[PDB]
Amino acid sequence: PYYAFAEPFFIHAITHLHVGSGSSVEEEIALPFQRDELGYPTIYASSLKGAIKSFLLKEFPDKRDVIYKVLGEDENPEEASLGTFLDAILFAIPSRIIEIDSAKPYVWVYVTTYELLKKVKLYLDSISQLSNASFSNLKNKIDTILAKEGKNITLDSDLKSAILNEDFYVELEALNNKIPSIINAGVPLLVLEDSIGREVINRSLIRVRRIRIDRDKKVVETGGLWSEEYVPMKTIFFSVLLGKESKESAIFASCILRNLRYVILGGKETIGKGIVELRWVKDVI
Amino acid sequence: PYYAFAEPFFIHAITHLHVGSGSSVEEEIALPFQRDELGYPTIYASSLKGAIKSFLLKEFPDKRDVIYKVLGEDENPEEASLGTFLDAILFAIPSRIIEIDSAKPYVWVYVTTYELLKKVKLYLDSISQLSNASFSNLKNKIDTILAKEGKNITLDSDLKSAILNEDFYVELEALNNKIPSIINAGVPLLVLEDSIGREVINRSLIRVRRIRIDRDKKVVETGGLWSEEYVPMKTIFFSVLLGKESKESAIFASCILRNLRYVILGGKETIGKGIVELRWVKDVI
Amino acid sequence: PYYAFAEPFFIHAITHLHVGSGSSVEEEIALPFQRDELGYPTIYASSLKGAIKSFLLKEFPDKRDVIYKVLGEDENPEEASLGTFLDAILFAIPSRIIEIDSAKPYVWVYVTTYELLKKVKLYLDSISQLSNASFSNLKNKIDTILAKEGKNITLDSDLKSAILNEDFYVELEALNNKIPSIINAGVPLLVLEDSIGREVINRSLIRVRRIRIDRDKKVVETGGLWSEEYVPMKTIFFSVLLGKESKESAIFASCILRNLRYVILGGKETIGKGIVELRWVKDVI
Amino acid sequence: STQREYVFIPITNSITIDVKITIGGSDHITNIDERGIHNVLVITGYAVDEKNGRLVPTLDPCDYVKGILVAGTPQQAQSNDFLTLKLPANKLYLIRKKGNISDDLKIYIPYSSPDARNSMKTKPVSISDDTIVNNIIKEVFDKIYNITQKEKVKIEKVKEDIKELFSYYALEQ
Amino acid sequence: STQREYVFIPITNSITIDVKITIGGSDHITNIDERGIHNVLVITGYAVDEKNGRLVPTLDPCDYVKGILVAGTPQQAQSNDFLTLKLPANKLYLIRKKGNISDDLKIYIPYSSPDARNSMKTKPVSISDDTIVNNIIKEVFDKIYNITQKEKVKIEKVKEDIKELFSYYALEQ
Amino acid sequence: STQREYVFIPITNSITIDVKITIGGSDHITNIDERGIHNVLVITGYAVDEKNGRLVPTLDPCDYVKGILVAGTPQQAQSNDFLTLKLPANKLYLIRKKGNISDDLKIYIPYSSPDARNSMKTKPVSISDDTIVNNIIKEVFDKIYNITQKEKVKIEKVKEDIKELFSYYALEQ
Amino acid sequence: YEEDYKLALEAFKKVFNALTHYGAKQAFRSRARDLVEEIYNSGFIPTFFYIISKAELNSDSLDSLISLFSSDNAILRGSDENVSYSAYLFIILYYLIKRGIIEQKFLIQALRCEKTRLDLIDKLYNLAPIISAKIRTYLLAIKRLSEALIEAR
Amino acid sequence: LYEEDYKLALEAFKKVFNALTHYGAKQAFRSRARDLVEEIYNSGFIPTFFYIISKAELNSDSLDSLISLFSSDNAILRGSDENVSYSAYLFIILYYLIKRGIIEQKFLIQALRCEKTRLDLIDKLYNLAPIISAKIRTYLLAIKRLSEALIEAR
């Protein structure tokens, strides 16, 4: 096999999030996020592994040997790693909402589209045949949702209509079943058609103008003006930590990963960005 | 722990303040305030850091090196910073109230919603895990509040009912009358729901038409007419200052932040905006 | 000290005063007075700065460079301005009185509230820490007033009862017949609990319907009818003028603000509104 | 104080009589509420002994026993093999955590001498053969836990989670 | 004038017989009213010597000890190992800071020479094992803040704030 | 079934024994909680008949009778003279309406034929001469409300509420 | 979200239909354009006394009102001035019945009997500072509707 | 996506441009185009709609002008340039609502023809005010820019 077990997990942005990519000038930001191939935000597996590696080496300074085994070395780039991350897949971005004669009044909802769920199902289905990863309720819900493709669907059967991010009017309909809350927030999840979901999601991302100021006369410096995208709080990405069979891998997964709730991802940590809560999909859902 | 010190603090607007996020593509006339990921006002911690840093570089010119260390150099930074700011979460905005009939009547009140308390709870939960700090008093009070998340409540008062910002009639409910205060002020605090809180809080902001007059004839010059959102006085935000251990961070936390009471955030400083008082939750609660 | 000089002052309306607040569709006065964050009238420091700057620029045409330094440039700002106006808090509005329980018959009286005094105290407390100047006299007067909060309070008289603005009845208490009247006038000052203070202050304002008559026949024009809003003459607003360390700041505080008494605040100047007298606290108390 | 004990969960029908008392006090962590077992404990570096399943201490970090920890005591006829030791309720290794524990707890472990005559080659064993899972709920989670059939009606899922969430390692020897 | 004596608050019981003036003067800078402890003193660059607890001076600004400021004088058995100093009350590091002070005090502190014969590697120490707080409350606040057990039935409050408040640094030799 | 009985509040003590049931059900619409008497039903068009006090059927909207609401069916010497009626829980003219009802209710009324041999020229009558307040408090306001003089100390309130809340119209005959 | 404009629409439907003569409509429009500024400046209780004094609250006009609260087929009859003033009184009372400021049974039972219009006004008096704050937007809406749907003399 | 709204803005502007015949009417409509979208998004759609209709003076003549304008493109709006400009803006809004399937052209054109139905039209608008405010913003901003560009400052 040589990938013996896989642990899926979610990634909830606690603060805003900036995992950066190649700065350029064509997309009129200056510093975007990491688009996958469909323009959705995604955390590359390299960024995930590196950030988590650094966090763990700082936190558990003794297991440095175990961490260097599972995640790899840097002074001995001879033996490969026993563990890998998949690129974090955007799962549900939070969107603002204005209810339209709907029972429970919400001011924000989670939003997904159908490509995002197709990729999530790809991951789950692919890792399912490992005899350790069952969680068949999860892919059950994903599949019953994907069956209803082509319609703005809501996993809370009361909205029936909404305005998302103060610009997009979507007329919803319920999944004809209850399909219990995938993400344990008390907030409805909305799966939208792809064309409109991309609009809603691109408008859910934060875009900030930033400046550098001279400390003397409090006036902006020349050329000191740019902009950058953050992924909002509350955002959920999905990935899997694939491991091989060894016993450093076992000791890793048994005590490194039991105690790994919050992690620092991406850049701009001094600005506060990058805090993240890792939810292991073996207890929730 | 990931952080040597974790110092949560409040931000009481002493005068109205205007933090930026300049004019958009639609509201080309407005200078809006900095917005959240769900529409509320916020101070992006890049602005918090720039403002506090510029202030500290002058109030403590002998400790310019303790400051460059913790808050990052700016001439030729050979390394990263040791201190972080998390973005400022609106905690409680003030609103004008017309109390129907109760104990000696009020003319304004502190208005907070439930979603803002949930964000504050996320902050307090994350940093109590990444650092040896435990804010069990604040977390305790905030969870006692969050237990009642389906109704409008009131803290350290009863009021039974009121008319906030002369447009919204809310029917309140005293929490338990055993619960001590959060912000040790006298005016009550209403934790409105989120649908009604969004509207009350949009009413508490201050849009202002401003003009530029020709000096030599006292007429508005062609073009000089715009709007500006402010955030009232008495407004309370909530942020955290976090630091890694470096013996400059110890001094910082123990010399700088003990002598940090008033700062100036945001812009429009000439017209008296931006004066702010930091409150260091460690000694408010 | 963050500020070189800090000069609180009082604005006494010589004539009626109209600083405009911009008109909206749901407004009920065509031309409304600028309002505070909790309903009272104020003067946005934009208006103070522009007013006083124009006045100075034309009255001290030799000191143009000092004005432009402390109050920013008009043609090309390559730097900030060293001078800062805080928004003028309404200090005391005059109100009609009919005496009961008294001895000396007054025709009017000065009215202020505890919330206005708390805002003034915030101004003072912050400006003392942000500068080399303490205002212990004004601070102690305001604090010995604020000790008596809740209870309506007369300062220098023995009224013990009164009817304010024809409708509102207050049973006063004499604070102390040894506290020097902050107001330099010889008329008493009542400090009212706010629930009633705001009603009195709303009825003190002056509303006035004007018309526009066709200039070919003494009959009105279609649409030429509106209402206006003024604060009475003899109203007092409290503000602060703040300066960052400079040489021009010394000249400003040295012989501009010592030759600066009467200005023209606001609009409706052809109607003879807005003649104002500034009275620096450095010499008025 | 708090005395609690760890019951092993293999398919073999030796788990029935391994205790005296179930409740003892008011302090229990391995609860079940509409979703399944919470705070399932996992002992690493040990192994089930399926022929009368007990815990032999191996040295292998790929070996473990998924069982549950409930207040009680072993048979009042133990403490010769049984590993009794107290942990501060945070140096545990538990799964599906519903809520925290009181920072202090003594624990009974069904243990056995390593019996140095057999080559401890171990075998990873799941819990399947739903007929075997049934009665091993009946004599364990229907006997120790009585809150079945009053709030747990969809028992099929309380079997299902046990199927995959309760795996372990044996001796095959 | 108004003297002040510094009660270090470590886990150890080295606060046994150290204060003579219980009150004597006017008050304590440390207060207890409805918000737990107020106006706590924190001495940095100093570790503790919990074996005969007396602040040893290191230089590392990352070592600190947080105690209270009673109005006392030491035992008439001192002026040799204790430190004492007169400083203007606004140099002081105070947390839970509530009110102004006399602008000048004579602070006495349990002090100890460094013993330069074994390199000091100090280690943080938090206060747990709630029997430790349960007897330190009686060991200091009972004698000083007899207000406790006289006003605050929420000894749980003046207990939990203690636990989450007084950390310090121990020599660890 | 939820079914109440309305007893009016005249100034006569002809209301002593006119029922066979005191509490009847579970809640008394008329509540008395530190603010006086509440949910007091106003019945218009009907004047009082102090000579065997009953609600005469008058057609004038100015005439009316006020009283309280309690549960049951009175005295079992009736069912020929009373106005029973079944109301949907909101058609009632209650004052200071405290809470809501169960979408329906069925109450009773002391009803009379008008005996059209004398002109009913009514007159309003209020409750003064506090002696009547006291004898009805002891008489009716405790025989059905023993809650008063057990918890309520501000009986004076529900005392003075008798004067202020009950006008009504006597036939003068 | 503004339901006072909705409530205003309902009240304006009622009164706009309950006035037969067009002069009555136009008089109502003028009352609408004027009494809102009056109630802002002078306050609620003075303006209420003004309105009810120019309304001619006999038991006939009050009957037309009490029916108007439910009828959809009632008619305000009288002189243009009296009916305009009574229509505005209905505007105000209709706001008070909705928004639960006054119990509808009380308002009706008082409109019927003359011995209770004084108690109506007493309750109105006790509540005046609340009404004067709430009703502002309702009355501005009625003003806009009047100057939109009716013409001028 | 709302790219269609620029075609819509252009044709509606051509309408209300070649309808207003006197140039004072054009400059008044320019001022309306500028300030009324600001008011819509600061105060709300319903308040601003009430304000507009109150200043448009919807009589029979004005309303047949509006309807023929929906149809003809030869109509001409007369009558007191302030009122004619407020009615031009009213038409801009109603034209969006029609050409985008929010109000049905039949229901609307009916409602401008009868008086029992103007109230029901206003009620129907109120019930869809969130949707109208959300969807009409790009269109209104385009109209505002078009007026600034094509009509001379006053």
Side-chain angles (χ1 to χ4, degrees), chain A residues 182-196:
Chain A
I182 282 182
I183 43 189
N184 292 17
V187 154
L189 173 75
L190 266 65
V191 193
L192 311 192
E193 188 256 313
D194 307 331
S195 178
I196 179 72

Side-chain angles (χ1 to χ4, degrees), chain B residues 3-283:
Chain B
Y3 293 123
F5 62 102
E7 304 291 354
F9 63 104
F10 296 111
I11 291 171
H12 292 65
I14 301 294
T15 71
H16 310 310
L17 75 160
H18 172 71
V19 196
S21 94
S23 283
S24 174
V25 283
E26 62 274 44
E27 292 279 343
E28 203 196 320
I29 202 174
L31 302 184
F33 204 90
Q34 260 165 21
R35 287 282 170 245
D36 207 354
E37 84 270 345
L38 71 166
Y40 299 133
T42 194
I43 320 178
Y44 287 129
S46 67
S47 317
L48 270 167
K49 196 193 172 187
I52 296 196
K53 177 171 179 196
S54 190
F55 188 82
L56 293 182
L57 281 191
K58 312 185 320 296
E59 299 295 296
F60 308 81
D62 47 312
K63 302 200 171 62
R64 203 164 292 248
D65 322 312
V66 167
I67 292 161
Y68 280 153
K69 191 88 199 279
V70 189
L71 302 196
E73 201 89 18
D74 45 358
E75 296 87 358
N76 272 108
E78 303 93 327
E79 74 156 36
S81 320
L82 286 146
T84 76
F85 282 99
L86 317 185
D87 303 280
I89 288 164
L90 176 66
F91 185 79
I93 212 162
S95 71
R96 322 177 281 292
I97 192 181
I98 305 193
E99 195 287 317
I100 316 290
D101 46 355
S102 310
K104 307 309 180 180
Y106 303 98
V107 297
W108 69 285
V109 79
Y110 268 124
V111 162
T112 191
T113 72
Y114 285 107
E115 286 302 303
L116 296 172
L117 284 185
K118 295 178 193 289
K119 307 173 69 155
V120 164
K121 177 185 179 60
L122 284 192
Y123 275 21
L124 290 170
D125 268 341
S126 89
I127 75 182
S128 89
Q129 192 75 262
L130 290 152
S131 73
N132 256 338
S134 158
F135 316 101
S136 64
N137 274 104
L138 191 41
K139 318 218 286 196
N140 186 18
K141 300 196 286 177
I142 281 183
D143 65 49
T144 60
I145 298 174
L146 284 195
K148 297 263 179 57
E149 201 265 330
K151 60 195 72 61
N152 303 347
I153 53 163
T154 174
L155 275 298
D156 270 292
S157 279
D158 42 9
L159 299 188
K160 191 75 68 171
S161 161
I163 308 178
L164 317 167
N165 288 135
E166 60 266 353
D167 261 30
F168 309 92
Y169 169 86
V170 307
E171 180 88 24
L172 308 158
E173 157 170 329
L175 193 140
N176 279 112
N177 308 53
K178 331 289 172 303
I179 175 68
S181 164
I182 290 184
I183 40 178
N184 222 11
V187 70
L189 169 63
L190 319 181
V191 196
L192 303 196
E193 282 149 329
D194 321 281
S195 164
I196 188 77
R198 173 170 47 178
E199 302 314 313
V200 179
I201 281 166
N202 195 60
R203 281 301 282 252
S204 282
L205 309 179
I206 301 184
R207 295 88 189 169
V208 158
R209 327 291 327 271
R210 305 203 32 200
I211 66 177
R212 173 175 67 254
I213 291 179
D214 190 351
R215 297 289 166 79
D216 292 318
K217 52 205 68 62
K218 200 175 162 54
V219 290
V220 167
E221 304 188 37
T222 289
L225 175 64
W226 70 100
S227 296
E228 280 185 2
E229 291 180 11
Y230 300 138
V231 158
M233 312 178 27
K234 311 173 176 71
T235 310
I236 299 169
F237 295 82
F238 174 84
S239 185
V240 194
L241 206 159
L242 309 152
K244 311 169 183 52
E245 59 163 1
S246 67
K247 293 159 205 163
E248 280 89 354
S249 311
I251 293 317
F252 199 90
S254 90
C255 177
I256 308 289
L257 308 185
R258 310 313 292 146
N259 299 118
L260 198 47
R261 191 101 195 272
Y262 299 96
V263 286
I264 284 87
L265 300 204
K268 317 292 172 177
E269 181 197 355
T270 71
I271 61 177
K273 303 313 175 298
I275 308 181
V276 157
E277 172 186 35
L278 318 189
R279 281 295 183 102
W280 306 121
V281 183
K282 81 176 290 183
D283 50 44

Side-chain angles (χ1 to χ4, degrees), chain G residues 18-32:
Chain G
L19 304 160
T20 84
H21 179 43
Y22 202 76
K25 284 188 207 311
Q26 304 181 313
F28 175 76
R29 158 189 200 276
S30 62
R31 302 301 98 83

Side-chain angles (χ1 to χ4, degrees), chain D residues 52 54-55 74 77-84 109-113:
Chain D
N52 173 24
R54 308 200 219 179
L55 259 62
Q78 299 286 19
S79 89
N80 48 356
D81 60 330
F82 262 68
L83 280 152
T84 319
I109 298 311
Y111 178 61
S112 300
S113 165

Side-chain angles (χ1 to χ4, degrees), chain B residues 1 132, chain E residues 62-64 121-126 167-172:
Chain B
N132 256 338
Chain E
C62 317
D63 306 285
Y64 60 84
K121 190 35 162 283
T122 60
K123 175 214 66 182
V125 165
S126 195
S167 190
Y168 61 101
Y169 270 69
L171 268 171
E172 295 304 297

Side-chain angles (χ1 to χ4, degrees), chain E residues 31-55:
Chain E
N31 319 318
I32 298 179
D33 188 331
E34 195 35 76
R35 307 295 299 239
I37 312 171
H38 292 297
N39 295 100
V40 165
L41 173 68
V42 183
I43 309 296
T44 81
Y46 271 80
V48 79
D49 178 20
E50 67 294 332
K51 192 273 299 172
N52 195 337
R54 281 145 216 264
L55 295 198

Side-chain angles (χ1 to χ4, degrees), chain E residues 93-154:
Chain E
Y93 191 105
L94 289 206
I95 62 175
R96 294 269 151 64
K97 191 162 172 37
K98 179 169 293 297
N100 186 9
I101 318 93
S102 276
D103 188 23
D104 265 319
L105 312 111
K106 286 163 72 176
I107 307 170
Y108 303 76
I109 286 174
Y111 166 75
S112 184
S113 275
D115 170 61
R117 65 169 153 245
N118 48 6
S119 180
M120 308 157 312
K121 190 35 162 283
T122 60
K123 175 214 66 182
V125 165
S126 195
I127 297 173
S128 200
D129 186 37
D130 318 333
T131 170
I132 300 182
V133 318
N134 268 280
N135 65 19
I136 196 65
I137 185 72
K138 183 266 306 171
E139 278 301 335
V140 62
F141 301 96
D142 207 357
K143 293 84 160 157
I144 298 291
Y145 296 102
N146 51 8
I147 292 89
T148 67
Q149 299 298 345
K150 280 182 172 206
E151 181 201 325
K152 279 312 301 291
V153 282
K154 274 74 60 167

